[PDB]
Design a protein around this ligand. Structure first.
Ligand code: SF4
Ligand code: F3S
Ligand SMILES: [Cl-]
Ligand SMILES: [Mg+2]
Lengths: 598, 261
């Protein structure tokens, strides 16, 4: 047993293993220990895959790098391409034209919406929603609930809900339950009434239908989704407004705006209201577990500047908060060797000296798969992993030595802190947060006949509910932003600026003989960076530190735990053989394990 | 009905994401897919084993990603064991095996030089089963659903080319019906990004387009319900459906001997 970051870790209790963790991207194992009353007292995050993409890049052309690193992940597709082109542009002192900037921002914000909404409905919802209880719902009373939760949503009739319920009952009676087979349905961990469950299942189906339209924005600008094309120096999608021969003309831009408008409707009428409703009911049940590090230490690089290349105009302004002091946002510099560092003390890699964290410009990725002395099982048949030694393919990133949570919640905490200190670019997330708190505390309880509560944003936000809420709010904000970006794009083109690529430094004969650069992105899951060194036209070093690397990290040299492990601590389980609460909290980070290990 | 069991090795999950973009069709009992299942851990593992017994030699195994042979196979761990062990176990009683995407078909990005995990395509590990390769990074959504639909309608694998790819989707090179072909035929090329030629949609050969040596349905079926494809949106094909495309030189280096095409 030992104490770290206010958490009293203890492994003497009953060990529980979850391998595979399902409804994530990629491969993860989780182990916990519970006390005599089934409360988690120890938690162990293991990334169970590695591909070695950083080493594969060595010796290749920096201009090709984006396509390789894009294949780190097909879920957060393109965010690695963006980080890569930004890193190469930073190394080579390349400034992209306005239209390329706006198109990249539209693509980024489209990914944010798609990733957030599909995650919630496709992967997260079943941790909160009992699908078998939806079968016991009254279609009339489900229709009445839909009017209270979101009056503007047109899909609301009793008959609409009744038809959905029948096809669910048919699928269920078939005997082929498919993805619902052997679920944890009927656990006391589920608290929603039948009508709220049927409503959620219905919106699941709407989300899965509509998500294929949203990504057509990537297809226009980038050729395909997943894995749209990017370009060092700009975008490949050249413009000619008024002709059908260029990649982008007015008709294609009108198509993009139609897709954006659809996104705005879905976020405000379906997604945000559902999360507010589910959040309220779980708050009423007292389920405010899962805060972990969000209560103390959060980080994001900052993103979406109003004015290209002017970080003071970031619409999701970043930095670092420590010790839960929201009145003091520290600035974060990706270039500073004493700020972002990665340890491998408890990871399956080796450094010359593993008591030191390496800034990614000096990063090293040399595998070392070895299991500690206290392992139960063998090298190829693990029964119980030994977290006192090396236990994950994920490295351990820290900021000035501190363990941080990253992601939409971190961004929303940072935005709120910035707004409090006078920042005028964070007004919208602040408004969203205050609206959401009033709904969760007062308006929704009033409408459902529940007691009003008085939780502050400082109490609500650092929780699994809060982490889920911030994602939905971020989706809404991203759709609003890209709607504005679209207008600015069309206005700039109509005024006569059609430029999409700066090719002045395309030829490697123009490059400095050595250079280093960093590109950062506010990716869906948090703070993404790519650090590159270029020597004689080739990649000399390429290191990625990815949001799920931060959140899913194993312990560091000092033994400090990362966000996943912290978030599971101190949580009761209804039934230690059913990982309902573990999955609910882990899924609130939207874990991407391929991203985490690359 | 024939169940489809979907396994995941070393992968980025693009093929799974592509599959859910299909418009036509939007049939199976997807009784195992780790990315979708309600159950986790031991309960997910148990679901897998019940289906294999009940439908012996009458389920389809679909594989996304690939197995690593380095690190004693523990660079991809499922249920505390190497992925290759799960792959071989499930393959043994499958009626047919689908290798989704370039990862399962050939290796894809993790198999690019120097391949630190010795990632190996499915057909090099499973050698005694009917396999179909569906390459691409990822494949087109309608190609993936088209393959499954054929197999479920007809209870057999469709006609394959010598490389194991379905002729119904991989018989043509991109360059055969690419809409920029008349420009290629007239010597009309982009030379620099966003040049006048690029704004007129001229051929991308001199910008590195690998369409002339790449078999896929991208120029006709196109992507995301026929919205666009790489070339239409202005970037050359990078060859993503062809074996070893990451190690065929820079994506921006042109093919040699233009007259061949
Ligand atoms: S080289 Fe590429 S862009 Fe040109 S016609 Fe062939 S496939 Fe199309
Ligand atoms: S890069 Fe791939 S998606 Fe098609 S146009 Fe070329 S085969
Ligand atoms: Cl390949
Ligand atoms: Mg890394």
């Amino acid at each position: 047993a030992y104490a770290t970051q206010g958490f009293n870790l203890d492994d003497r209790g009953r060990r529980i293993v979850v391998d595979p963790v399902t409804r994530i991207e990629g491969h993860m194992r989780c182990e916990v220990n519970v006390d005599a009353n089934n409360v988690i007292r120890n938690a162990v995050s293991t990334g169970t895959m590695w591909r070695g993409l950083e080493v594969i890049l060595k010796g290749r052309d920096p201009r090709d790098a984006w396509a390789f690193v894009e294949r780190i992940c097909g879920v957060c597709t393109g965010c690695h391409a963006l980080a890569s082109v930004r890193a190469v542009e930073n190394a080579l002192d390349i400034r992209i034209p306005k239209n390329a900037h706006l198109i990249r921002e539209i693509m980024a914000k489209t990914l944010q919406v798609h990733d957030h909404a599909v995650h919630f409905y496709h992967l997260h919802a079943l941790d909160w929603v009992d699908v078998m209880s939806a079968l016991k719902a009254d279609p009339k009373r489900t229709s009445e609930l839909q009017q209270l939760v979101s009056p503007a949503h047109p899909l609301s009739s009793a008959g609409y809900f009744r038809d959905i319920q029948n096809r669910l009952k048919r699928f269920v009676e078939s005997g082929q339950l498919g993805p619902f087979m052997n679920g944890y349905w009927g656990s006391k961990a589920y608290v929603l009434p039948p009508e709220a469950n049927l409503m959620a299942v219905t919106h699941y189906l709407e989300a899965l239908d509509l998500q294929k339209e949203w990504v057509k924005i990537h297809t226009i600008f980038g050729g395909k989704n997943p894995h749209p094309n990017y370009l060092v120096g700009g975008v490949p999608c050249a413009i000619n407004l008024d002709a059908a021969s260029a990649p982008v003309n007015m008709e294609r831009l009108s198509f993009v705006k139609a897709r954006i408008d659809e996104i705005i409707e879905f976020n405000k009428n379906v997604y945000v209201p559902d999360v507010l409703a589910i959040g309220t009911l779980y708050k009423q049940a007292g389920w405010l577990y899962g805060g972990g590090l969000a209560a103390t230490n959060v980080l994001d690089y900052g993103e979406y500047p109003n004015v290209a290349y002017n970080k003071s105009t970031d619409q999701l302004p970043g930095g670092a908060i420590l010790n839960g002091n929201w009145d003091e946002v520290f600035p974060v510099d990706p270039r500073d060797s004493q700020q972002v560092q990665e340890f491998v003390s408890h990871s399956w890699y080796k450094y010359a000296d593993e008591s030191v964290g390496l800034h990614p410009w000096d990063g090293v990725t040399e595998p070392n798969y070895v299991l500690g002395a206290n392992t139960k099982g063998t090298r190829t048949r693990i029964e119980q992993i030994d977290e006192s030694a090396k236990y994950s393919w994920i490295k351990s990133p820290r900021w000035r030595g501190h363990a941080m949570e990253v992601g939409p919640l971190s961004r929303y905490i940072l935005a709120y802190a910035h707004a409090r200190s006078g920042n005028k670019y964070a007004e919208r997330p602040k408004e969203q947060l205050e609206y959401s708190a009033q709904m969760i505390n007062s308006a929704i309880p009033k409408a459902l006949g529940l007691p009003e509560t008085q939780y502050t944003l400082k109490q609500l936000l650092p929780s699994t509910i809060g982490r889920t809420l911030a994602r939905a709010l971020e989706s809404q904000y991203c759709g609003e932003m890209m709607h504005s970006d679209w207008h600015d794009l069309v206005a700039n083109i109509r005024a006569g600026d059609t430029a999409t690529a700066n090719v002045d430094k395309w030829d490697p004969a123009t490059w400095p003989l050595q250079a280093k650069g960093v590109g950062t992105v506010a990716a869906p899951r948090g703070a993404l960076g790519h650090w590159i060194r270029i020597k004689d036209g080739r990649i000399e070093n390429y290191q990625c530190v990815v949001p799920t690397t931060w959140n899913g990290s194993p312990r560091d040299y000092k033994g400090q735990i990362g966000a996943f492990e912290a978030s599971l601590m101190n949580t009761p389980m209804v039934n230690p053989e059913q990982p309902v609460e573990i999955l609910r909290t882990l899924h609130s980070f939207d874990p991407c394990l391929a991203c985490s290990t690359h | 009905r024939t169940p489809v069991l979907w396994l995941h090795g070393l992968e980025c999950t693009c093929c799974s994401e592509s599959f859910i973009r299909s418009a036509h069709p939007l049939m199976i009992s997807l009784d195992y897919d780790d990315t979708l299942m309600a159950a986790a851990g031991h309960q997910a593992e148990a679901i897998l084993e019940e289906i294999m017994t009940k439908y012996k030699g009458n389920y389809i195994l679909a594989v996304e990603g690939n197995p690593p042979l380095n690190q004693d196979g523990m660079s991809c761990i499922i249920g505390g064991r190497p992925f290759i062990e799960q792959l071989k176990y499930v393959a043994k009683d499958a009626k047919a095996i689908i290798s989704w995407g370039s990862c399962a078909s050939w290796g894809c990005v993790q198999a690019a030089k120097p391949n630190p995990t010795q990632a190996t395509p499915v057909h090099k590990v499973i050698t005694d089963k009917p396999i179909i390769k569906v390459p691409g990074c990822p494949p087109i959504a309608e190609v993936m659903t088209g393959v499954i639909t054929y197999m479920l309608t007809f209870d057999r694998i469709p006609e394959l080319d010598r490389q194991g790819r379905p002729k119904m989707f991989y018989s043509q090179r991109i360059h055969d019906k690419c809409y920029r072909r008349p420009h290629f035929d007239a010597g009309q090329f982009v030379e620099e990004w966003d040049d006048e030629s690029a704004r007129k949609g001229f051929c991308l050969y001199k910008m590195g387009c690998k369409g002339p040596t790449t078999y896929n349905a991208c120029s006709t079926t196109r992507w995301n319900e026929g919205t666009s494809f790489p070339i239409q949106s202005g970037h050359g094909c990078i060859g993503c459906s062809e074996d070893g495309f990451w190690d065929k030189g820079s994506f921006y280096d042109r093919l040699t001997g233009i007259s061949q095409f």
